[PDB]
Symmetry: D2
Subunit: 385 residues, 4 copies
């Protein structure tokens, strides 16, 4: 189960670089130089890395310092052959963003947020990124009177429209991906799920430029089924990128390594990406627990990849098994893929077998054979066939 | 706090008519004749009622029995002056719908579901309904292999497209409202939230015919903020109807009377509907608890209306208070309503006060004064000014 | 992975016998005669069955009918060699129990509840049951004013004390097990978790007679860690029985087959029961989904047992692996089992290496190596060593 | 609604002193000197303050610096007349506690944790504290193999036993209060709820010395009913202290001001404390949101007290209303307070009216009149009588 750069596994600098500060605790690990992370990731078999502006260039850096930071990073990429398929902006750490970036009540702040974003879009293109993520972690509220949501959506639309005008005018080959999260750090965050983000995109001036970047843990903090949310993004043609990690139910965002948390949901996600022919990066947005030292960080990162490869194998074996193919037919998955009324409205209306003469009791008596199918799925996942 | 028919309060037959059967218990109350419910509701000050096909005409009724059921109902409406602004279909009780209506794996079932729906659309128009609700309570799964979500969305789209073709061809003045719910009775239900339903509508052939019917308790079963979800529906121009009730967090769907459950969320919802000028029905989809007799049912129904009227009064007093208007200015709600960059992209890019010369520390130091505003909101809700 | 009666697997009559009625739907399956369930379970390899009074003898049965029902059941047991290790009372279905059994506000009801319970204790002993379960599904409330919890606990204590006096006086060899659940069917249920039930037992007149019957899904409806709750019951010497099934997070109680829901939590539960030497019944309290016919019911029941046996194998392989034993030492599990201060209070107070000279930074720098250990656990579960 | 020192309102230094650092953000406010907090709290009408060792004396302080810190604090208390009714230990911030204090795997750490605790017990007594709280925020795990819960409970018991031996030997007049929390910062924390802590106390060598310190938000992060948990602590005679704040459901711990979050649950809590004659401190463990400046901190602190006083008034009016007293009788609250069988076991067994002649249908038909009672409760809370 050895990964190679062909598996397209990526990691954010902020993941293996998390120092372990939490709401109740100081850091347990020293900071990692981005160059070191690049090298260690390459040795593990990763394909590339991602970054927030602030991960690469310390906030408030002079143009001189900025150039120096970039050059060193670029050298590491050249030395290892690692790519940079996505980048994003930090619009959440600094105190100025306490009420949001694009939807802060203060107009001056909103203008600042757009300028900080545009500067990073330029760098991202320079580095070859294909996707630019936006997670509005501070857009929301803890109380009802603080934010008029209709006005905030107007402000969010305005912001994304200006970014689309910008890339268009420059002639850049980059697309945007919005990342939803229901809460934390705000009481409630705007665009809380994959559905809310998809619905919002349809109101932008150039909808073709925007998709979603769903994250496992995020949809599970609302108790939603991740594989179902991803199927809806695929159906809309909007899965531009994906964030993989683990989460144990509805609580604070844990960011465990991928495979931990809900294992069966991880299995069904892998089955789907692989069946659907998803060809984007398999990005891990996780945090090695603060209990670990450096050895532990690398082990956790390696486990992310290992878990994906084991699941891939098990899902493939599941779909290729003749006995499973037979069970899918038994459960009428074939019939779900056929049109209900290709014959049209009129033909449906005139068809007595559809109502007048339909034997409802006979249809009701037919078992779905879902439990036998699910048990074959479990046997496959566990290597117990 | 007396309601009148002008307040536009409505109730489903199934609400005051719930006999009290739950997953672990038999009925505690006898069935109510629809005619009796109409009369009792009129006396309490309700404006109208709503129904599923099966609430009005017992499943499997002959055409003769059907006509008889309708005529009696129509007489009650005439006697009391009650209206019927919405109707819907039961595609969840009968065993034939065990795997869904529009997205059942069996094709024969899907065809049956559409025929049963079309028959009720005809009645709804006859009775003067303006809105037709669709809650797909059985569309979903308990296991991953049972439903290919991409195929199910194809099937759901096909179903809604055929219904749109139908109303168009007949020349009916009726619009559709999709009602999301995250789970129960299925393990996971498709289109689980207000966002997922809004995103789906944008892919239908004639999107103008469809909106949402959000329900308080439903979004709270996913731990989402209801007033925020409603603001997004308002922003999209898609709030065609609304279901009001109460819920105590993430658990089974309780369906308490409106006002019970999350009281502060009820306050913010009322403030919003009233501020936004929502002119549709205020419908209560709730269940008087099984502990109650008939006297208790009517008391609970009366409480739904009473609670809305008290909240309306308190929200109005909140918005009209000079001291609140001053606090909103202090918290920069005025600034949130102004465009970020009406000056345009170029002007933003050339504005040094937006980046180069922006004093981030001075901006960061500005308190939002949100807690004083929230305390004025609490004082108002409690009548403690 | 074939079960035999030696594995001690048991099922309630109500599990494979669930007809599929839910809050929104009618039954999908016909009722099963208890004799048929006994025979089918024996053929699958089960060790025994359990029952509520009402599952075996229809409510309101004459003494004549009662005897007839028992005799037929007894014949089935003799024919198959199945045992009856536990029984319980139905104090939740009939409308009289709408406000509870032992804690109903009406005193007459409370007296009735105790009489119905005592009659079943007698039968249970006759059939050879060793454990009597009590799940107070209707003890609780939907509103704050309806129940004074202090008075209700007095009433609950009184009830359990009288039952203890009863078994003592009769000389029966039976112990009681209280089963907690947080909600459903009441808004909140009293004694909502394993901890609340353990704390309550310590206030009864003869605490030795009572333990807990925890259920997987129940603790997961509160988002708690089941294996941790079971370890606390084991530590107190109070795990008298256990209910196994599956649950997908915080929502309505699903009652999936064991192994479904949280698979990793199922793995850790098996590891614990097996390590601790739990020698009681492995009882399955689950519901085959309403989508299934009879073939599906038996397949789901078979899957419960299969899943336990696979997990048992994987946990055993995990604990026996030399490389795991080494990792446990690396993570200081050995040190957690040694007393902190067997030397005593004074020796601790005088030990400078414990404070004055303790090198906090050196201790802080030591990684716990938890992620490598967890990855070995995952590899083992998946059969990927 | 003006508080006075007689209302017994207290605050932790860490509450109004929270700088606003979260998992995703830097501090938004400067640190407050403990002397300033004491003075500002006194002016608002607070009765006293509480502290962790580390809030008062910076970690790693010399004995010289320690004495200086104490003296300054003592002067502030004398100047204002504020008291210190409770103190606690910080066993969670420093990296050495990454795996816990009392239950860390490393034995050396466990010994250190006890020494740090004993030093603070001494100071607490010097300052006049009556209660010593213990919140084991780092005792728990993120993975199943990392902690053997049976061994950890042995370790936790050992720790509390040694602390009891210590206070006993010194002759101190102080009692311990254990504070449960389900998760955050660990994946799962040991003793997750009020029930688990109550059950654990019963296994300590001198159970009389220990009680619980429940916190509103903590039990709500598991979706439990706080007023019910408090009634069980009252019933056991174990409510030694209480932490008041607000929380919006199952998510990260928000720590809103008291009254925010679940308002109806706040009403029922106040009704209970006041009815039961709770005479301990009304302590606020909350965090003014990071959006606020200093003015906002004081406003939020003032709101905590204001909200309690308004609720107190409304609960008192509720209980004193003749119409409510009549409704309570209608709902049989009087009957819940009478013994079920003061006549005894034998008399119950011989009473035909309890079974043989009990009219179950007549009893079942009796409505509980809970909704009318709940509506009177709502009317009272809202000042709408
Ligand atoms: O909840 C944290 C989010 O996952 C972020 O890591 C984004 O993906 C990048 O800003
Ligand atoms: O969860 C139940 C839903 O609220 C239904 O009552 C719909 O509104 C009507 O089918
Ligand atoms: O939630 C349902 C409970 O699990 C019951 O099945 C008990 O175990 C028996 O009354
Ligand atoms: O979750 C944080 C806890 O409430 C702490 O504030 C304790 O009360 C004191 O250590
Ligand atoms: Mg996250
Ligand atoms: Mg992410
Ligand atoms: Mg509902
Ligand atoms: Mg509804
Ligand atoms: Mg259950
Ligand atoms: Mg059970
Ligand atoms: Mg907290
Ligand atoms: Mg606290």
């Amino acid at each position: 189960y050895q990964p190679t750069p062909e598996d397209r596994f990526t990691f954010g600098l902020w993941t293996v670089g998390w120092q372990g500060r939490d709401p109740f605790g100081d850091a347990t690990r020293r900071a990692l130089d981005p160059v070191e992370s690049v090298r260690r990731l390459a040795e593990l078999g990763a394909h590339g890395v991602t970054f927030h502006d602030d991960d690469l260039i310390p906030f408030g850096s002079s143009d001189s310092e900025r150039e120096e930071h970039v050059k060193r990073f670029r050298q590491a990429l050249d030395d290892t052959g690692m790519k940079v398929p996505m980048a994003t902006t930090n619009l959440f750490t600094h105190p100025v963003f306490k009420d949001g970036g694009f939807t802060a009540n203060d107009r001056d702040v909103r203008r600042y947020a757009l300028r900080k974003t545009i500067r990073n879009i330029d760098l991202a293109v320079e580095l070859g990124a294909e996707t630019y993520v936006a997670w509005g972690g501070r857009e929301g509220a803890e109380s009802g009177g603080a934010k008029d949501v209709r006005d905030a959506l107007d402000r969010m639309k305005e912001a994304f429209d200006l970014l689309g005008e910008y890339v268009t005018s420059q002639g850049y080959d980059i697309r945007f991906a919005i990342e939803p999260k229901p809460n934390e750090p705000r009481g409630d965050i705007l665009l809380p799920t994959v559905g809310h983000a998809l619905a919002f995109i349809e109101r932008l001036e150039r909808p073709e430029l925007y998709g979603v970047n769903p994250e496992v843990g995020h949809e599970q903090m609302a108790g939603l089924n991740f594989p179902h949310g991803i199927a809806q993004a695929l159906w809309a043609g909007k899965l531009f990128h994906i964030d993989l990690n683990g989460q144990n139910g509805i609580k604070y965002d844990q960011d465990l390594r991928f495979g931990a948390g809900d294992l069966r949901a991880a299995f069904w996600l892998v089955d789907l990406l692989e069946s659907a022919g998803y060809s984007g990066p398999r990005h891990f947005d996780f945090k090695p627990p603060r209990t670990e030292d450096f050895d532990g960080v690398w082990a956790s990162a390696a486990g992310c990849m290992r878990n994906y490869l084991i699941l891939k194998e098990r899902a493939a074996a599941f779909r290729a098994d003749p006995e499973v193919q037979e069970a899918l037919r038994a459960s009428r998955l074939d019939e779900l893929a056929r049109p209900t009324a290709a014959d049209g409205l009129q033909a449906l209306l005139d068809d007595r077998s559809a109502f007048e003469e339909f034997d409802v009791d006979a249809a009701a008596a037919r078992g779905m054979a879902f439990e036998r199918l699910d048990q074959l799925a479990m046997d496959h996942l566990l290597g117990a066939r």
